[PDB]
Design an enzyme around this catalytic site. Structure first.
Site, PDB file in Angstrom:
ATOM      1  CG  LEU A  12      -1.819  -1.139   1.444  1.00  0.00           C
ATOM      2  CD1 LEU A  12      -2.565  -0.931   2.746  1.00  0.00           C
ATOM      3  CD2 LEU A  12      -2.800  -1.284   0.311  1.00  0.00           C
ATOM      4  N   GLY A  13       2.076   1.236   0.519  1.00  0.00           N
ATOM      5  CA  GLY A  13       2.978   2.398   0.444  1.00  0.00           C
ATOM      6  C   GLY A  13       4.337   2.219   1.099  1.00  0.00           C
ATOM      7  N   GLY A  15       8.005   5.288   2.487  1.00  0.00           N
ATOM      8  CA  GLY A  15       8.576   4.610   3.661  1.00  0.00           C
ATOM      9  C   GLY A  15      10.029   4.133   3.531  1.00  0.00           C
ATOM     10  CD  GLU A  88      -8.781  -0.001  14.186  1.00  0.00           C
ATOM     11  OE1 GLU A  88      -8.378   1.189  14.326  1.00  0.00           O
ATOM     12  OE2 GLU A  88      -9.955  -0.361  14.429  1.00  0.00           O
ATOM     13  CG  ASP A 134       4.870  13.887  10.598  1.00  0.00           C
ATOM     14  OD1 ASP A 134       4.989  15.031  10.091  1.00  0.00           O
ATOM     15  OD2 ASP A 134       5.061  12.854   9.934  1.00  0.00           O
TER      16      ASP A 134
HETATM   17  O1  LIG Z   1       0.175   3.932   5.342  1.00  0.00           O
HETATM   18  C1  LIG Z   1      -0.407   3.519   6.530  1.00  0.00           C
HETATM   19  C2  LIG Z   1      -1.754   2.811   6.492  1.00  0.00           C
HETATM   20  C3  LIG Z   1      -2.440   2.562   5.263  1.00  0.00           C
HETATM   21  O2  LIG Z   1      -1.879   2.972   4.065  1.00  0.00           O
HETATM   22  C4  LIG Z   1      -3.647   1.923   5.243  1.00  0.00           C
HETATM   23  C5  LIG Z   1      -4.215   1.525   6.390  1.00  0.00           C
HETATM   24  C6  LIG Z   1      -3.642   1.720   7.625  1.00  0.00           C
HETATM   25  O3  LIG Z   1      -4.361   1.247   8.712  1.00  0.00           O
HETATM   26  C7  LIG Z   1      -2.355   2.388   7.734  1.00  0.00           C
HETATM   27  C8  LIG Z   1      -1.608   2.677   9.022  1.00  0.00           C
HETATM   28  O4  LIG Z   1      -2.164   2.288  10.201  1.00  0.00           O
HETATM   29  C9  LIG Z   1      -0.265   3.376   9.088  1.00  0.00           C
HETATM   30  C10 LIG Z   1       0.477   3.670  10.309  1.00  0.00           C
HETATM   31  O5  LIG Z   1       0.051   3.370  11.614  1.00  0.00           O
HETATM   32  C11 LIG Z   1       1.693   4.319  10.188  1.00  0.00           C
HETATM   33  C12 LIG Z   1       2.221   4.703   9.020  1.00  0.00           C
HETATM   34  C13 LIG Z   1       1.577   4.462   7.856  1.00  0.00           C
HETATM   35  O6  LIG Z   1       2.182   4.894   6.690  1.00  0.00           O
HETATM   36  C14 LIG Z   1       0.319   3.791   7.838  1.00  0.00           C
END
Ligand SMILES: O=C1c2c(O)ccc(O)c2C(=O)c2c(O)ccc(O)c21
Length: 272
Positions: A12-13, A15, A88, A134
């Site tokens: 999903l991403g 990082g 979640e 942040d």
């Molecule tokens: O990118 C997320 C994230 C997400 O993309 C989709 C569902 C999600 O539940 C999270 C998420 O809990 C999340 C996070 O706790 C910390 C950094 C993040 O980049 C994320």
């Protein structure tokens, strides 16, 4: 225990890490699976029982009790070079940066609801002893169906304290003038500053300041039509002197904050 108990899906991403869509097998709760590599963690803590973990996890555990506008830590694991967090995954979801990028500036009524929910969520964290550090559009997810905002990335967070902070890992264009000039700030008042940056963004489509000089100068130009009360609240949060900024209470009792819609009505009116 890990690869057995959950089923991995698309990335999903990244990082802050690398996050995959995942499904819990026990029952099909969407979850998100975040991997963080040991070598990139500058900042560690310890849980009750006393294990040596990344602060993110400390902070997430403190805030994940009960409901709120924070995305909850359901579990976590250690591996030889990485930690892995299970979070979640609301469904369907979009982050505020993408949302704003698509629909431009937001009607006041929508911004007021969103902003209010961020306020509640931040209150919740402060309450639990956590400071996020942040707060920005891309660290807020929208649950499109219920109209519920959720905070996400605690990796620059810290334990809340009254002392003056000397470190900062968040986004610059969101950092307060006291940090730019003196390399020091206090939690609550820095958070209010960033909340002020956030609110401008909601109602203008873009952030107010790009360069250090504009932040330190604290003059806010509005590039969009914005009610007089909203400009007032924003300017107040973005006061140069920390002590001249509002507390959460004061923000929440501001005229522009009155008669906030509930999440569900917000989704009906603005998201369906
Ligand atoms: O990118 C997320 C994230 C997400 O993309 C989709 C569902 C999600 O539940 C999270 C998420 O809990 C999340 C996070 O706790 C910390 C950094 C993040 O980049 C994320």
């Amino acid at each position: 225990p890990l690869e057995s108990q959950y089923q991995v899906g698309p990335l999903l991403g990244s990082g802050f890490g690398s996050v995959y869509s995942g499904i819990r097998v026990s029952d099909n709760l969407p979850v998100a699976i975040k991997h963080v590599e040991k070598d990139r963690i500058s900042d560690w803590g310890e849980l009750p029982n006393g294990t040596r973990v990344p602060m993110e996890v400390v902070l997430l555990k403190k805030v994940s009790s009960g409901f709120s506008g924070v995305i909850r830590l359901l579990d976590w694991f250690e591996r030889p070079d990485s930690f892995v967090l299970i979070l979640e995954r609301p469904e369907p979801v979009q982050d505020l940066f993408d949302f704003i990028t698509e629909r431009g500036a937001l009607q006041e009524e929508l911004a007021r609801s969103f902003f209010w929910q961020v306020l509640e969520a931040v209150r919740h964290c402060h309450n639990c002893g956590v400071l996020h550090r942040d707060i920005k559009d891309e660290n807020i997810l929208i649950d499109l169906n219920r109209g519920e905002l959720k905070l996400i990335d605690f990796g620059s967070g810290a334990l809340l304290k009254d002392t003056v902070y000397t470190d900062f890992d968040g986004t610059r264009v969101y950092s307060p003038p006291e940090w730019i000039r003196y390399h020091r700030y206090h939690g609550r008042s820095a958070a209010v500053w960033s909340l002020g940056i956030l609110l401008y963004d909601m109602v203008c489509g873009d952030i107010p300041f790009e360069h250090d000089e504009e932040i330190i100068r604290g003059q806010v130009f509005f590039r969009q039509r914005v009610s007089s009360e909203c400009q007032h609240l924003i300017r107040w949060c973005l006061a140069l002197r920390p002590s001249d900024r509002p507390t959460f209470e004061e923000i929440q009792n501001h005229p522009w904050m009155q008669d906030v819609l509930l999440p569900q009505e917000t989704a009906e009116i603005h998201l369906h």
